[PDB]
Write a protein that binds this ligand. Structure first.
Ligand code: ATP
Ligand code: CA
Ligand code: CA
Ligand code: CA
Ligand code: CA
Length: 901
DNA sequence: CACGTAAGCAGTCCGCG
DNA sequence: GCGGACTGCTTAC
């Protein structure tokens, strides 16, 4: 097999590499790598190395890496560019793996672990590690086993062994319901003292050294706790055994408000699952507890226990251990679904970077572009300092707030990467500038043609047309990968809808789900078999189709993220290829493209309708337009349609056969006007929206920019079994909006769009009447809580104190003195509730850690003093008032002459 | 900790005769 | 009582 790296480090003048050899074995080597860097040289000097601008360079070979680093410093002292890859381990990987890396995940040791630490005096700070580690569960992907290290004797209590028999049993048998599928995979090791536990864990770690190390909050808690505890008990040298190269560093992670400390373990790649989830999931969650995320992702119930976690080991050690094991398993289950480890490996090996560098698109693209240029013996420029400067972004059209009955939307494929490719935007393809006219002059095609030689953006920039830049070349490769995965995602989505339709008429039979590949549209034979299946098999098939869709989503959306981040990185001062000329060339071209096509679509539809000056495009944001289809429907007449699906088909055909060709013609003209390298502005129909045929539903509405709702029947070729609400920006979509309020507002919107005013009024009246019965957590607002200390003046709100911070300070006074009470952690999220006048808390609101029940000492008082009136007005009535006034209808029935008879 | 900008709403402070 | 200036937070793209 082809060899591949596992980890790489620079330690002094040595590269330390763990890798899989040509026989599939894990090996480690220390290499005295001699790096090369580059200086410009006379044109008269013969060389094969050239910088990206075509200027010749001499290669400087250094005796060691420290010599190379010192040379860079000298070159700065002299005032001369030091060219080449200054991160020597990336150069090492490039030299050692000079081909497309094919990796075998089965050979990569992926470890998932979680620790327990009983603490009677509040949160056990990892920097102090003053409390015993009393449980570790460590899952190893190569063994497929859960290794459980269980401390039976502690200063906080002596306990009996954990029983695997009780663990397997149902909660109703007094058991812990550890999933039957992992029971046989548990290797249980009890210990009569903590020193013995930790020494054995380290021996185990040496035998089974993680390559990828993950878990939940492992980087911020588990790793620093274990390291510091071992350091405290045994000394530094023993703690450093967590690194295969016995090297660690305390790393200070700094933000805008403060800083925290993590432990870098050289020769390990830590991918904390909470950070993978935050970067790659495209959610914003009210809480990031594992319990909360597991419920959201997997629909598994809360791990229930009595009393504080600080007393769980003493009171119920059996449950304590079982829950530690389940915690580790839940992360594996989340990964089986979301597949972020697979994503990181894919991206990391593609770029030839340390796998943990996938968090950084700047590092990822630096390596991709470096490897690409190196293939041609080209030499990368030195990174430079730049001051941070603001620059313009996208255009967003101001919509007229209204209901909109029939709507068809259109959207440009991968816009910013497509602009880069079309225009040929790259550091080395800059050809010069032209004199810029106001943007509106280009939009209306009245400005002088920018160039007859070069490819142009309306920000004034010109680019070469003779050859692709490295940025277009490399962005295209990842774009093409993305396109493949999006194909699979949409097929699985369409396949899901087939199954949903068949579920209307399930068969009374005992059968099995079909063995099919959900990434490909179901054949006719499969469709006929599906129509004969039981509900049990159909539901299992739906679950599998949906899992395939999620896998495709992860793969496609994060490749989209990577390529969009390259466009963004051109506007980040730390990117080697930072250039506001290129960043603005992309964004200004985008503004033109949207407004150009707005004009073209209006012109086309005014022509076919026989009108003049009528605005068919009602809205647009960045790269999308929303077209009113009312006049199109009215031209055939609503009464001519058999059912909803009939007019959806008609609009689909109209969009495909009439509008898209006109849009294409419009963009080809724009490409010629800008003299671009390649026409890549591909704007396809996205959504078809409208009320159910024969209903009083309004179809859709806009309140403002980035705030709208549509009743969608077809999205990007997926014809839904049931209409789907596309809601953007509105409070139903915000993590800050209470859970039950999101749900209620969504139903209000559904009724507005599908059923009409009377239906909306009926639901509002009921919600208003019943909402006080809702669980307090379900009606609590949510906010991130930054700068608590800034606004804290003797326990009370300082000037300009934000509402949620005020709530935290209220909470802090109420729990004062308690070492046990849950503390609000700076930078994390809180639930927030308003408090009625004259409450014993002394202020108008209270806040507590999100994803938790408020502590029992004040729970009863919070419940008694919760201000339901304020809660309803702020989270529900105010947003609903906005939706309904925009839509020109009332959530309460107005008086009429009919009242009364 | 980790790519970019546009832009919405909650809330504070305080003007507005 | 609303709105501008401002901070804070959160989405859409
Ligand atoms: N997370 C992001 N970071 C940087 N730029 C972004 C991001 N999201 C969107 N953009 C910019 O807005 C443009 C339009 O965004 P949109 O979400 O429509 O996706 P797209 O890139 O056009 O891909 P698709 O093919 O899925 O439409 C992008 O091309 C770019
Ligand atoms: Ca725990
Ligand atoms: Ca798009
Ligand atoms: Ca059937
Ligand atoms: Ca879009």
């Amino acid at each position: 097999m082809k060899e591949f790296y596992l980890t790489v480090e620079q330690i002094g003048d040595s590269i330390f590499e763990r890798y899989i050899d040509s026989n599939g074995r894990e090996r480690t080597r220390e290499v005295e790598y001699k790096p090369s860097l580059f200086a410009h040289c006379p044109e008269s000097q013969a060389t094969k190395y050239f910088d990206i601008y075509g200027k010749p360079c001499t290669r400087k070979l250094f005796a060691n890496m420290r010599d190379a680093s010192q040379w860079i410093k000298r070159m700065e002292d002299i005032g001369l560019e030091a060219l080449g890859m200054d991160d020597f381990k990336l150069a090492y990987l490039s030299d050692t793996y000079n081909y497309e890396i094919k990796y075998d995940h089965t050979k990569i040791r992926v470890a998932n672990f979680d620790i327990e630490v009983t603490s009677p005096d509040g949160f056990p700070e990892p920097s102090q590690a003053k409390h015993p580690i009393d449980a570790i569960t460590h899952y190893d992907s190569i063994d497929d086993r859960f290794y459980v290290f269980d401390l039976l004797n502690s200063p906080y209590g002596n306990v009996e062994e954990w029983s695997i028999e009780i663990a397997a049993k149902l909660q109703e048998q007094g058991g812990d319901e550890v999933p039957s599928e992992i029971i046989d995979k548990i290797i249980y090791m009890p210990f009569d003292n903590e020193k013995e536990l930790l020494m054995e864990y380290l021996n185990f770690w040496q035998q089974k050294t993680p390559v990828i190390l993950t878990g939940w909050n492992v980087e911020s808690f588990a790793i620093p706790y274990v390291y510091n505890r071992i350091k405290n008990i045994f000394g530094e040298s023993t703690a450093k055994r967590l690194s295969p190269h016995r090297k660690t560093r305390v790393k200070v992670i700094e933000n805008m408000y403060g800083s925290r400390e993590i432990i870098t373990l050289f020769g390990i790649s830590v991918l904390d699952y909470i950070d993978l989830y935050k970067k790659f999931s495209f959610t914003n969650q009210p809480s990031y507890s594992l319990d909360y995320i597991s419920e959201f992702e997997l629909n598994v119930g809360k791990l229930k226990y009595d009393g504080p976690i600080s007393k769980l080991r003493e009171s119920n050690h059996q449950r304590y251990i079982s829950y530690n094991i389940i915690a580790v398993y839940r992360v594996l289950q989340i990964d089986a679904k979301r597949q972020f480890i697979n994503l990181s490996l894919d991206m990391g090996y593609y770029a030839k970077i340390q796998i943990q560098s996938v968090f950084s698109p700047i590092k990822t693209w630096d390596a991709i572009i470096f490897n690409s240029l190196k293939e041609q013996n080209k030499v990368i420029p030195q990174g430079r300092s730049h001051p941070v400067q603001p620059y313009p972004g996208a255009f967003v059209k101001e919509p007229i707030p209204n209901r909109y009955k029939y709507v068809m939307s259109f959207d440009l494929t991968s816009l910013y990467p497509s602009i880069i490719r079309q225009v040929n935007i790259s550091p080395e393809t800059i050809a010069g500038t032209f004199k810029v006219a106001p943007l509106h002059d280009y939009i209306n095609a009245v400005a002088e043609r920018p160039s007859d030689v070069y490819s142009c953006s309306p920000n004034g920039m010109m680019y070469y047309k003779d050859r692709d830049g490295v940025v277009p070349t490399e962005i295209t490769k990842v774009f093409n990968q993305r396109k493949e995965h999006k194909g699979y995602m949409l097929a699985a989505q369409r396949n899901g809808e087939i199954i949903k339709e068949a579920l209307h008429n399930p068969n009374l039979s005992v059968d099995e789900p079909l063995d099919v590949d959900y990434r490909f549209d179901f054949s006719d034979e499969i469709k006929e078999k599906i129509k004969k299946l039981s509900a049990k098999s159909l539901n299992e098939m739906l679950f599998r189709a949906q899992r395939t869709e999620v896998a495709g989503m992860t793969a496609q959306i994060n490749r989209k993220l990577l390529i969009n981040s390259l466009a963004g990185a051109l506007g980040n001062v730390w990117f080697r290829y930072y250039d506001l000329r290129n960043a603005t060339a992309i964004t200004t071209f985008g503004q033109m493209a949207l407004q150009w096509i707005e004009r073209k679509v209006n012109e086309y539809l005014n022509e076919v309708c026989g009108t003049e000056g009528e605005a068919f495009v009602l809205y647009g944001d960045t790269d999308s337009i929303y077209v009113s289809a009312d006049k199109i429907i009215d031209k055939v007449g609503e009464s001519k349609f058999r059912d909803t699906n009939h007019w959806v088909d008609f609009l689909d055909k109209f969009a495909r056969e009439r509008m898209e060709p006109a849009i294409d013609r419009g963009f080809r003209e724009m490409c010629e006007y800008m003299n671009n390298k390649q026409h890549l502005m591909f704007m396809d129909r996205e959504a078809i929206a409208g009320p159910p045929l024969g209903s009083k539903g309004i179809g859709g509405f806009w309140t403002g920019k980035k705030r709208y709702a549509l009743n969608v029947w077809d999205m990007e070729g997926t014809r839904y079994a049931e209409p789907k609400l596309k809601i953007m920006g509105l409070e139903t979509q915000k993590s800050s909006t209470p859970k039950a309020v999101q749900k209620a507002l969504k139903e209000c919107i559904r009724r507005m769009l599908q059923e009409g005013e009377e239906s909306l009024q009926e639901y509002f009246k009921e919600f208003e009447k019943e909402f006080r019965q809702l669980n307090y957590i379900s009606i609590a607002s949510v906010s991130s809580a930054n700068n608590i200390a800034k606004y804290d003046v003797g326990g009370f709100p300082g000037p300009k104190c934000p509402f949620h911070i005020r709530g935290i300070l209220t909470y802090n006074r109420a729990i004062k003195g308690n070492i046990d009470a849950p503390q609000v952690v700076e930078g994390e999220k809180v639930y927030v509730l308003p408090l009625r006048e004259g409450n014993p808390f002394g202020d108008k609101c209270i806040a507590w850690p999100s994803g938790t029940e408020i502590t029992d000492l004040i729970k009863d008082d919070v419940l008694h003093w919760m201000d339901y009136t304020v809660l309803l007005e702020k989270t529900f009535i105010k947003p609903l008032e906005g939706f309904t006034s925009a839509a020109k209808l009332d959530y309460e029935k107005k008086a009429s002459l009919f009242d009364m008879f």
